[PDB]
Design an enzyme around this catalytic site. Sequence first.
Site, PDB file in Angstrom:
ATOM      1  N   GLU A 104      19.667 -13.669 -12.001  1.00  0.00           N
ATOM      2  CA  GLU A 104      19.632 -12.492 -11.110  1.00  0.00           C
ATOM      3  C   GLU A 104      18.447 -11.526 -11.329  1.00  0.00           C
ATOM      4  O   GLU A 104      18.468 -10.387 -10.882  1.00  0.00           O
ATOM      5  CB  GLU A 104      20.976 -11.745 -11.130  1.00  0.00           C
ATOM      6  CG  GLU A 104      22.207 -12.617 -10.819  1.00  0.00           C
ATOM      7  CD  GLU A 104      22.022 -13.575  -9.632  1.00  0.00           C
ATOM      8  OE1 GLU A 104      21.746 -13.117  -8.513  1.00  0.00           O
ATOM      9  OE2 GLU A 104      22.171 -14.806  -9.812  1.00  0.00           O
TER      10      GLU A 104
ATOM     11  N   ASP B 241       7.963  -9.842 -10.221  1.00  0.00           N
ATOM     12  CA  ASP B 241       6.726  -9.236  -9.749  1.00  0.00           C
ATOM     13  C   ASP B 241       5.641 -10.299  -9.555  1.00  0.00           C
ATOM     14  O   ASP B 241       5.440 -11.142 -10.435  1.00  0.00           O
ATOM     15  CB  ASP B 241       6.214  -8.192 -10.773  1.00  0.00           C
ATOM     16  CG  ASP B 241       6.788  -6.787 -10.546  1.00  0.00           C
ATOM     17  OD1 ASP B 241       6.333  -6.108  -9.612  1.00  0.00           O
ATOM     18  OD2 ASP B 241       7.668  -6.343 -11.331  1.00  0.00           O
TER      19      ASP B 241
ATOM     20  N   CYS C 236       1.486  -1.274  -7.311  1.00  0.00           N
ATOM     21  CA  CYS C 236       1.238  -0.502  -8.528  1.00  0.00           C
ATOM     22  C   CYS C 236       0.145  -1.154  -9.360  1.00  0.00           C
ATOM     23  O   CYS C 236      -0.085  -2.376  -9.254  1.00  0.00           O
ATOM     24  CB  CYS C 236       2.502  -0.435  -9.369  1.00  0.00           C
ATOM     25  SG  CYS C 236       3.828   0.527  -8.604  1.00  0.00           S
TER      26      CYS C 236
ATOM     27  N   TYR D  53       7.289  13.891 -10.267  1.00  0.00           N
ATOM     28  CA  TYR D  53       6.081  13.637  -9.475  1.00  0.00           C
ATOM     29  C   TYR D  53       5.430  12.288  -9.836  1.00  0.00           C
ATOM     30  O   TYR D  53       5.368  11.892 -11.015  1.00  0.00           O
ATOM     31  CB  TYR D  53       5.086  14.780  -9.639  1.00  0.00           C
TER      32      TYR D  53
ATOM     33  N   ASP E   5      -6.646   6.928  -4.271  1.00  0.00           N
ATOM     34  CA  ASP E   5      -7.455   6.040  -3.448  1.00  0.00           C
ATOM     35  C   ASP E   5      -8.899   6.105  -3.980  1.00  0.00           C
ATOM     36  O   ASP E   5      -9.335   7.147  -4.520  1.00  0.00           O
ATOM     37  CB  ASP E   5      -7.506   6.517  -1.974  1.00  0.00           C
ATOM     38  CG  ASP E   5      -6.199   6.259  -1.173  1.00  0.00           C
ATOM     39  OD1 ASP E   5      -5.420   5.347  -1.478  1.00  0.00           O
ATOM     40  OD2 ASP E   5      -6.003   6.967  -0.168  1.00  0.00           O
TER      41      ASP E   5
ATOM     42  N   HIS F 131      -2.879   5.987  -2.059  1.00  0.00           N
ATOM     43  CA  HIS F 131      -1.921   4.964  -1.658  1.00  0.00           C
ATOM     44  C   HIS F 131      -1.694   3.894  -2.713  1.00  0.00           C
ATOM     45  O   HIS F 131      -0.941   2.953  -2.480  1.00  0.00           O
ATOM     46  CB  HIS F 131      -2.344   4.354  -0.327  1.00  0.00           C
ATOM     47  CG  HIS F 131      -2.485   5.373   0.755  1.00  0.00           C
ATOM     48  ND1 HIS F 131      -3.631   6.115   0.929  1.00  0.00           N
ATOM     49  CD2 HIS F 131      -1.601   5.823   1.675  1.00  0.00           C
ATOM     50  CE1 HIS F 131      -3.459   6.961   1.929  1.00  0.00           C
ATOM     51  NE2 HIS F 131      -2.235   6.802   2.402  1.00  0.00           N
TER      52      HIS F 131
ATOM     53  N   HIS G  88       7.389  -5.200 -16.847  1.00  0.00           N
ATOM     54  CA  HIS G  88       6.408  -5.852 -15.985  1.00  0.00           C
ATOM     55  C   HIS G  88       5.039  -5.147 -16.044  1.00  0.00           C
ATOM     56  O   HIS G  88       4.010  -5.780 -15.881  1.00  0.00           O
ATOM     57  CB  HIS G  88       6.885  -5.939 -14.523  1.00  0.00           C
ATOM     58  CG  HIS G  88       8.108  -6.787 -14.309  1.00  0.00           C
ATOM     59  ND1 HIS G  88       9.086  -6.970 -15.266  1.00  0.00           N
ATOM     60  CD2 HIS G  88       8.528  -7.474 -13.218  1.00  0.00           C
ATOM     61  CE1 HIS G  88      10.042  -7.746 -14.781  1.00  0.00           C
ATOM     62  NE2 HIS G  88       9.736  -8.044 -13.528  1.00  0.00           N
TER      63      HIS G  88
ATOM     64  N   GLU H 110       6.981  -6.282  -6.364  1.00  0.00           N
ATOM     65  CA  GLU H 110       8.139  -7.182  -6.364  1.00  0.00           C
ATOM     66  C   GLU H 110       8.308  -8.015  -5.086  1.00  0.00           C
ATOM     67  O   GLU H 110       8.180  -7.506  -3.966  1.00  0.00           O
ATOM     68  CB  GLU H 110       9.428  -6.402  -6.614  1.00  0.00           C
ATOM     69  CG  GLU H 110       9.567  -5.937  -8.064  1.00  0.00           C
ATOM     70  CD  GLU H 110      11.016  -5.719  -8.436  1.00  0.00           C
ATOM     71  OE1 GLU H 110      11.871  -6.026  -7.578  1.00  0.00           O
ATOM     72  OE2 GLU H 110      11.284  -5.235  -9.563  1.00  0.00           O
TER      73      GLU H 110
END
Lengths: 195, 195
Positions: free
Chosen positions: A29, A33, A58, A75, A80, A116, A133, A154
């Site tokens: 289960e 990634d 990420c 936060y 970018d 982004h 990961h 993922e």
Amino acid sequence: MTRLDSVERAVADIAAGKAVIVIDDEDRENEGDLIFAAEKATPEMVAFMVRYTSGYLCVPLDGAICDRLGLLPMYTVTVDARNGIGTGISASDRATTMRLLADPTSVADDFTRPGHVVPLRAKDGGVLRRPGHTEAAVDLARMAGLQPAGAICEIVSQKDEGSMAHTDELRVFADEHGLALITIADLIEWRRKHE
Amino acid sequence: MTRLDSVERAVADIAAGKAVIVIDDEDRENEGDLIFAAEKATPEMVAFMVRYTSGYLCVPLDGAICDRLGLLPMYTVTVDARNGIGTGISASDRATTMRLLADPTSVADDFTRPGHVVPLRAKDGGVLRRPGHTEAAVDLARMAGLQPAGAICEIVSQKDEGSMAHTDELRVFADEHGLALITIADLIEWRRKHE
Ligand SMILES: [K+]
Ligand SMILES: [K+]
């Protein structure tokens, strides 16, 4: 029973600019990634990742990169690339941002914030210190002789659209796309066995 | 020359739990957001959005919701639902988070931070005050008689994989999936004409 690939295969694949898939262990289960080295980000590779994953991309980073860039001091933080992009969201734009993050010549001012792409700070010591990961991604780039910076997201389930892919489905995806599927358990074992 | 749908169609579609696509104006190089009302988020709708967009899902919100939740008072803010989810990234999990954000009974403690959904604060006055996709999303939910909360993400180009879809391709996507394509220019015009 799910066949798992070897750390040697994963590392060679990462060195070659390929992606791999990483899960925690043999549990059926686990989510997984898609992982490649950030310096190996191309429009084509990021498009592939965005197509098959959550899209919430990420960028695991060594602490030293974070510190160099004034990010995530020891936060949500997002960035970018300042130059060479449009709105920042395309596969080509996020690929540029990823390469810039892996580029040891980049500085804080080379990035606009917010953005982004989501940087993550890996624990020093990698998976031997935190079996995440995030750590797996940086460890793999390091082991491939690359700059310690990765890209992770993922994989979405294609069988049950509301869900993320679990181990058996991840095996199928990896086989269909010619990719290695490895576990953090095995990466820990390998790193312990080879200093 | 690109055919555009009407604000009346967009609003009825939003009311019905459908998605629409919103671009700035008739310029042929606009990117476009897939938009639905956040209270209408289902596993199926969020799966559709994740499949065809950047996956960097955002939730435009009225200032009052933001204030109620202790978010974005007048670094990127992210949230997940505290309850009823797994890791927070699946279509089903992000759909839960989105519905919770639109739910006027939710409070700050109903969310964990950081998370995987990006709230955005819409300007009071909507597109008449700031002609953004954020404002378009909230205006459309309001016009449909729904809680002032939307879900937005930009559609990826299927023709040029490194890019985001522009106006002509967006027209094709909308037609193929039975969706309205509207512009912020026309939404501004409509809102001016009807108080
Ligand atoms: K996608
Ligand atoms: K996707």
